[PDB]
Amino acid sequence: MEAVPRMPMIWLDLKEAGDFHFQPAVKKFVLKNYGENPEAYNEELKKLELLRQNAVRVPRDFEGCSVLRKYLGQLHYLQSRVPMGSGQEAAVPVTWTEIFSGKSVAHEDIKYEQACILYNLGALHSMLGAMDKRVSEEGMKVSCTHFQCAAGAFAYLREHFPQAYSVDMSRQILTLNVNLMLGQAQECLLEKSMLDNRKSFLVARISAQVVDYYKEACRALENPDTASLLGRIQKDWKKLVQMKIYYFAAVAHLHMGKQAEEQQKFGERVAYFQSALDKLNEAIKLAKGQPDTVQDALRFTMDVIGGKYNSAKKDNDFIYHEAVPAVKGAPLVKPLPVNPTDPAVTGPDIFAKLV
């Protein structure tokens, strides 16, 4: 199973930005409250304006993540010196497009700009995670890291910002995203654990945790209001996620059977391999119409599991004659921290001189 074709991954689209005309409000505030020439900070203001322009047209690459993190941090630095939050003196309209409806949503609140940038950091990480083939050591590692980073961004958004500036960033939707991203990180970890020839004991537990994350994502996708918001996207995601629940359950029980093989409990071995084959057959039914990438993974796994089940039953029936009978998850991935105000990720405070 170390050589199994890779399943495709889900990613999220980036949100589209509208206007955030901070410059005139900053100048008014500098003149009225800092008592200084309103044109004394034009270099700082142009540097921030250029950074926003870069962030809202971010390249879909690892450098783009750094741009979003830098801009997110500089918005925190600006807010610490000029009050542009809800109801505050220097607040100006912030407009972004809600991604599922295509409608513009405006709030006079710099933290809404921060929220959308952080969302896009999560979305970009999900894209980068889903782009690699996951066949190289560096590619498997970075894909896992990307999905952990995506989970961390959506979780930070959920916990540290006003709730539901727009419905694409509501707590329930962000929780779906976090679970999906952790499930995909755990799937990347499973692939690596099999290439590293970890103990069947551990591989089964890792795969069981993949199932656990995807089951929670599936539960969320079945919620009628989530299904309504995501529309046809919910149909697409649910088909892939529901198939993966059975696929990785089969992978877990395959490795439980291999543990029985190692412990010379050849009756248990047959029972786990039979359960694995039954779960994989359900995954194959659920994969009707899925792309060739999905079909290739399932066919490869059918060759492994079907052949192991057959040989295990033959060995039991004619050699060992053991009774055939009738898994706790290992969460080893976590959302990785955003650290929005660490100077190593933000660089120097653009407005350090405004004091």
Numbering used by the authors: 1 to 326, 333 to 361
Show sentences the authors wrote.
His domain protein tyrosine phosphatase (HD-PTP/PTPN23) is a tumor suppressor that regulates mitogenic receptor downregulation, endocytic recycling, and cell migration (Chen et al., 2012, Doyotte et al., 2008, Kharitidi et al., 2015, Lee et al., 2007, Ma et al., 2015, Manteghi et al., 2016). A central feature of HD-PTP function is the ability of its Bro1 domain to recruit CHMP4, the major subunit of the ESCRT-III membrane remodeling protein complex (Doyotte et al., 2008, Ichioka et al., 2007, Parkinson et al., 2015). Crystallographic structures of the HD-PTPBro1 domain in complex with the relevant binding regions of SARA, endofin, and all three human CHMP4 isoforms reveal that SARA and endofin binding is similar to that of CHMP4 at the conserved site, but critically extends into a neighboring specific pocket unique to HD-PTP. Altogether, this study identifies the Bro1 domain of HD-PTP as a highly selective interaction hub that coordinates recruitment of endosomal signaling adaptors versus MVB sorting and receptor degradation.
Y2H experiments confirmed that this region is also relevant for binding to HD-PTP, since CHMP4B lacking the C-terminal six amino acids (C4BΔCT) did not bind AlixBro1-V or HD-PTPBro1-CC, while full-length CHMP4B did. CoIP confirmed that CHMP4B-FL, but not C4BΔCT, binds to HD-PTPBro1-CC. Next, peptides designed from the C-terminal 18–20 residues of CHMP4A, CHMP4B, and CHMP4C were evaluated for binding to HD-PTPBro1. Interestingly, CHMP4 peptides showed much lower affinity to HD-PTPBro1 compared with the SARA/endofin peptides, with KD values of 132 ± 7 μM for CHMP4A, 85 ± 2 μM for CHMP4B, and 89 ± 1 μM for CHMP4C. For the CHMP4 peptides only 11 residues are clearly visible in the electron density maps, whereas 20 residues are visible for the SARA and endofin peptides. All three CHMP4 peptides bind in the same way across helices H5, H6, and H7 of HD-PTPBro1, and form similar van der Waals contacts with a number of conserved residues, including the critical L202/I206 pair. Additional contacts occur with hydrophobic residues at the proline-rich C-terminal region of HD-PTPBro1. The main CHMP4 anchoring residues are a Leu and a Trp present in all three isoforms (L217 and W220 in CHMP4A and CHMP4B, L228/W231 in CHMP4C), which contact HD-PTPBro1 residues L189, L202, and I206 from two hydrophobic pockets between H5 and H6 and H6 and H7. Thus, binding of CHMP4A/B/C to HD-PTPBro1 requires rearrangement of these side chains to accommodate the critical CHMP4 Leu and Trp residues. Binding of full-length CHMP4B to HD-PTPBro1-CC was unaffected by the T145K mutation, confirming that access to the S site is not required for CHMP4 binding but is critical for interaction with endofin and presumably SARA as well.
